C-alpha cells in the first residue's frame, strides 16, 4: 500500500462491468456498441481470481466504485464508472459494500493488492451543461462547488484544460472547482475513508491533467497509499512533472513509441530505445510508473495487427520494463477492439482459457519477474538499461550485476528468419549458462562475453542466469 510496496507489483486492469458476471456465464451477450451494463460484478471478479493470479499478476485495478448517473444517456449507460454523482454510495450494478469489502479480502488472502480507480475532476450528467441540476450531486449539491460551464477547446491552454468541462452537451461532465477549500477538504476526507472502508491498497487517479497541480499532494497524503495518475499526454516534458505532485503516473510517454515499434514489422526501435532513456533521465522515478500498451481509451494492440509474435514481444516489454506492468483484461486473449466503445469487450466471452498463447507468455514473464524480485532487492530500483538495438531488435538489461534479466525483443513478426544475434553488453561472464525463460532453452555466454542469442519466429527472448534459478519452478 506504500509506494515502495508497489514497485514489486504487477497489475491486471479490468472493467468491473465487463470482466466477470456473478453467474459466471461465458456466453451472456455483451455488445460493446450498445454501451450498456453487461452485468459484471465484484463477486464475479472474486470467482475468477485464480485466472488473474495464474498469469502471475499480484494486483488488480478496477474501474471507479461510486454511484453513477442513473440514466441511459445518448452515449449509453455509465457502465465504465466515470460518470459519478453520489460519491458516498456505491454503484449497485456491481454489488454490495459487502461485496466490495469481500473483494479486497479474497485478494489479501492471496497476497494480492487492490487498486481502485477514482475520479476527482468531475461528475457526470445526462444532458447539456446549461441544464445541470446540481442538487443531484451528493455531496456537491450546488453550482458554487463547480467551475463555470465551458468546453475545453485547445489543450495547449493548460488553464482551460483545468477549468473548462470535459465532454459535450450530450453527456456533460460538471467540473468541480478543485481550487476552493470546500472541495479540497471534502475530497481529501472522502478518499481516506474510501480507502479505509474497503481496504484499498492503492489508487489509480483519472484525468489528472484536468485538475490543477497543487490539489494532488493533499489528495495523495489523504489517501495514504500509492497513487498513480492518468495524465494523458505522450510528451515526457508534460507528463513526467506530474510525478512531482503524486507518486506515479501512467507511462504514456513510453506508450506511443512502444506501440509503433511493435504494431508492424517496420516499427521504429530507435524511438522506443530513446524514449526509454528519456524517461529514465527526466521523469523523477521511472520505477514508479505504470507500463502499458492496451487500455480502454485507445485501440487495442491487436486492432493494429494479429501477429502473435508481435503481441508476445509487447506483452514482454510491459512486464520487464521499469515500473509496474499493467495488462488490460482481454489483451491476454488477443482482443482486437478499436476505440471506445469497441475496446470495452467483455472478458468472459473469451471463455477464460488459461492456455491461450498470450496467457502462457504473460505468465512466464511475470514468473521470472516475481522470482527475480524474490532474489534481488535491487531489481525494482535498478533502472532499465537499453543495451542494444538494430532495425528489428531492442535488447535491455535490468537487475543487479550477476542477477540481471536481459531481454531481447524483436519486431520481425511471426515469419521471421532464423539467425543468431551476437549480443554485447549483457554483462554476464564467459561460459555462464543462461536460461531463456519464455521457451525454456539454455544459452551459454561464450569467450568474449557476447551472448549468442538464437533468433527464430520473431519470438521474445528473456535471459536469466541458470545457477540463480536453482530453487524455482521456472523451467523444470
Ligand atoms: C465510510 O463509512 C462511514 C460509515 O461507516 C461513512 O461515514 C459517514 O460520512 C458522512 C459524511 O458525508 C457522515 O455525514 C455520516 O454521518 C457518516 N456515517 C457514519 C455512520 O459515521 C464514510 O463517509 C464512508 N466513506 C466513504 C468514502 O464512503
Ligand atoms: Ca478540472
Residue numbers in the entry: 1 to 476
Task: Copy the relevant paper text.
An innovative protein crystallization screen formulation called FUSION has been developed to help with the production of useful crystals. The concept behind the formulation of FUSION was to combine the most efficient components from the three MORPHEUS screens into a single screen using a systematic approach. Most of these additives are small molecules and ions frequently found in crystal structures of the Protein Data Bank (PDB), where they bind proteins and complexes. The efficiency of FUSION is demonstrated by obtaining high yields of diffraction-quality crystals for seven different test proteins.
In the process, two crystal forms not currently in the PDB for the proteins α-amylase and avidin were discovered.
